Subunit: 263 residues, 2 copies
């Protein structure tokens, strides 16, 4: 039972903290003496098109600074000539954060030797993925199949992308697959398809921490923050939640032994 | 319940004391020889129109003097020349009085943090409000929307301006909005609008003090002065009466928990 795991990308498989799409947004602004927090950088994370450089331009403290350095408010060609260079700088920065998240290696190798198929879904796009994947493979990671919002009629909340990793990999009931992510949207995806939804923490978008900024965080505050993530996953779906990745091949057995049904 | 807060523009957010008009009325008179006090400068205020200078004209003591300088009493021309310059010196000084009152920043910083909208209304006019807004932005205060007596068929006594904020901010039931002010008129407006009215004291017109006078005033003296303002506001429908700005939020908790109804 459970013949395939449907992983995610930045936050799950690669790019710790899911900063790729962020850093870009920061430079675009910082390149005009604005300076913004990665904290504000997220917010409209899903849906990375121009409207985000418009929602980030309509933000309080943001509109302020901007109007203080240029002595005026963002123009229409300001959002443009900014997004035009978002895609640009991003497609050229994505490969910087395409390394398989430490230890994810062994997990995949292992899960295959045990006869498990590996698929995936993402928020990014074909063009965005044609850059991400490529680097990943040259770097050791390459699932058996991949799907982006471009392949289906809708994005991440819906199960559509997941119903295709199925067709390809060829796996009858949905209960035979596991969904793994790092965002409430992901849990909503798995607990929609009819799959087993699990949330990763240490390196997730939610916990939004850096692969080091987690070591400097003190023993009591980290765990303190981890639970916050965990709890937020659980209610949005998540049949299980894990901190690291080594704990997934521990969840599968459980699923099987446990003997609980997905309704 | 409290989705948005509608702030006043001169007495609540900026000008701690509301001396912009005052320190301009007494200059037009101090430039012609007849000096006057800021106390006399502000009998009626929401009427910054021409007949305000005319009221300081037919004011005994001030009628005296001027006659003992120009050897004659004011004329219809002496007035429509002091006003036809009142606003001209106003637009040049208003920027000097268009910066926040400390707390306003931190508070407005928050509020938006809990996702609360921020609109406004004023007695100042379109042109007057202009410049002020611009300078307020460069300083650290950019409410979501702004309305002036020019956008509606009337002034402050009437709700009109407040109704405009609702459409814009998209917060429908009036009673789901707070109305902060600094004078008897601001309360008349909020009550007529049908929202939760609140009046501030420290740094208001009804207290005509300075952010140096309030620090150089007796402990008992000041307290007495405030009570006059307080009793004043309440006497005009002010559902609440805050001293400074922090406590504006505790008021929201109170209102949301005291299961009370307006009108
Ligand atoms: Mg991700
Ligand atoms: Mg006022």
């Amino acid at each position: 039972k459970i013949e395939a795991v449907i992983f995610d990308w930045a936050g799950t498989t690669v790019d710790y903290g899911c900063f790729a799409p962020l850093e870009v947004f920061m430079e675009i602004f910082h390149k005009r003496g604005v300076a913004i927090t990665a904290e504000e950088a997220r917010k409209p994370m899903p849906l990375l098109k121009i409207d985000h450089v418009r929602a980030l331009t309509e933000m309080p403290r943001i509109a302020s600074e901007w109007n203080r350095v240029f002595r005026q408010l963002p123009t229409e060609a300001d959002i443009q000539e900014m997004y035009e260079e978002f895609e640009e700088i991003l497609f050229a920065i994505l490969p910087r954060y395409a390394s398989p998240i430490n230890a994810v290696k062994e997990v995949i190798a292992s899960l295959r030797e045990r006869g498990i198929k590996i698929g995936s879904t993402t928020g990014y796009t074909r063009e965005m993925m044609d850059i991400v994947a490529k680097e990943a493979a040259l770097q050791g990671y390459k699932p058996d199949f991949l799907v982006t919002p471009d392949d289906v009629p809708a994005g991440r909340p819906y199960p559509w992308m997941c119903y295709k990793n199925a067709m390809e990999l060829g796996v009858y009931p949905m209960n035979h697959m596991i969904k793994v992510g790092d965002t409430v949207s992901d849990m909503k995806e798995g607990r929609n398809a009819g799959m087993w939804t699990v949330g990763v923490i240490l390196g997730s978008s939610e916990l939004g921490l850096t692969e080091e900024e987690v070591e400097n965080m003190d023993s009591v505050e980290l765990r303190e923050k981890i639970e916050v993530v965990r709890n937020r996953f659980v209610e949005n779906g998540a049949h299980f939640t894990i901190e690291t990745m080594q704990e997934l091949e521990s969840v599968m057995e459980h699923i099987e032994k446990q003997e609980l049904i997905i309704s």
